[PDB]
Amino acid sequence: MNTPEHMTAVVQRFVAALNAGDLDGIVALFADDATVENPVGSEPRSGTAAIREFYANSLKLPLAVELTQEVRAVANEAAFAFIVSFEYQGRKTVVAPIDHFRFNGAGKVVSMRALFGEKNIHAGA
Amino acid sequence: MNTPEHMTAVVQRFVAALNAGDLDGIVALFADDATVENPVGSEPRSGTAAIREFYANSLKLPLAVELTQEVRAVANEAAFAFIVSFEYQGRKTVVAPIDHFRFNGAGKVVSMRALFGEKNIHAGA
Ligand SMILES: C[C@]12CCC(=O)C[C@@H]1CC[C@@H]1[C@@H]2CC[C@]2(C)C(=O)CC[C@@H]12
Ligand SMILES: C[C@]12CCC(=O)C[C@@H]1CC[C@@H]1[C@@H]2CC[C@]2(C)C(=O)CC[C@@H]12
Incomplete structure (x- = not known):
């Protein structure tokens, strides 16, 4: 049973896993x-x-x-705004996508779509 | 082709029209x-x-x-985070959804989905 609480917790675990590698x-x-x-x-x-x-x-x-804002979750789906920051050759980059997750009855993510274009990729710092 | 500028302009137009009724x-x-x-x-x-x-x-x-953040747009699709505020049933309310638009060849929105749940509905009693 996909509760908003479960989907939101999953988004948190996703973000945490990325940070921990x-x-x-x-x-x-x-x-x-x-x-x-x-x-x-x-x-x-x-x-x-x-x-x-x-x-x-x-x-x-x-x-x-x-996560830069609260997670949106409803009817087996969740969407979230966030940033991803990294550096290479003294050059800092911040990407600001909006991810969309669709969950199955078992509570697993069956689909992930990361929406962002070049204007959401910020170079410099 | 749907340019990021066009999709972003449409989102801005959408928000402005709502504000103006x-x-x-x-x-x-x-x-x-x-x-x-x-x-x-x-x-x-x-x-x-x-x-x-x-x-x-x-x-x-x-x-x-x-709009509370930059618009995300790529490949004929756009997603944006925003807030909708109003007074209802004697309580100041702020709803924070994430919308997703799909555009056709003529730059028109052919599909829109507003993703927000009860936890994104903030009523001030
Ligand atoms: C591709 C991109 C965004 C573009 C880029 O420069 C590299 C960066 C790598 C990490 C990706 C991110 C897009 C959003 C992704 C896919 C997530 O939601 C987790 C890993 C994230
Ligand atoms: C239904 C709701 C959110 C719930 C409510 O009480 C009224 C408000 C009316 C305006 C709607 C908004 C949901 C998001 C919508 C659909 C938009 O993206 C533009 C109009 C917005």
């Missing part, structure tokens, strides 16, 4: 046949193997992930 | 066969008539709407 933890929130579309408009990754690979590469560089 | 201004942004699902999980409403009725009913109370 806990790959297994992240993957554990997704269903076996879950799909990840990053960014929106690209071919979705499908399956545990593909999802694990995506997050492995996405975590090569240490990330500071933070 | 400009019913025609709002409906003009939608395709004649567009769908509105507000809130997410409810029965989708489609077609100009249904969409106009939804907004007319919504506008029966003065609405104070404002």
Whole structure:
């Protein structure tokens, strides 16, 4: 039974896993046949193997992930605003996406879509 | 093609029209066969008539709407975080949803979903 409380807690665990670089933890929130579309408009990754690979590469560089507003959750779906910060070669970048999660009856994430464009990628600091 | 500037402009136009109670201004942004699902999980409403009725009913109370973060836009889709404030049943209320728009080739919104739950509805008694 997908309660808003459960979906919201999952978003929190997702953000926490990214910050800790806990790959297994992240993957554990997704269903076996879950799909990840990053960014929106690209071919979705499908399956545990593909999802694990995506997050492995996405975590090569240490990330500071933070929820910037309250989580929106209703009818087996949740959306959240946040930022992802990292640095390379003394250059700071802050990406500000809006993620959309769809959950199944078992409470696992069956679909994730990260919506953000170049204007949401802020270089400099 | 849907440029990030166009999708962002439409979102801004949407928020402005709501603030001004400009019913025609709002409906003009939608395709004649567009769908509105507000809130997410409810029965989708489609077609100009249904969409106009939804907004007319919504506008029966003065609405104070404002974007709270940068608009996210990429691949014919946009998502934004905002607040809708109004006084109802003797209580100042602030609703904080995250909306998602899908655009067609003519730059019209063909699908919109407003994701917000009871925990995103803040009534001040
Ligand atoms: C691709 C991007 C955003 C673009 C970029 O420069 C790299 C960064 C890596 C981490 C990604 C993020 C998009 C949102 C993702 C997909 C999450 O929600 C968790 C990992 C996040
Ligand atoms: C239904 C609700 C939220 C709940 C309520 O009591 C009234 C208010 C009316 C305006 C609606 C808003 C939900 C989000 C909507 C649908 C928008 O994105 C523009 C009009 C907005």
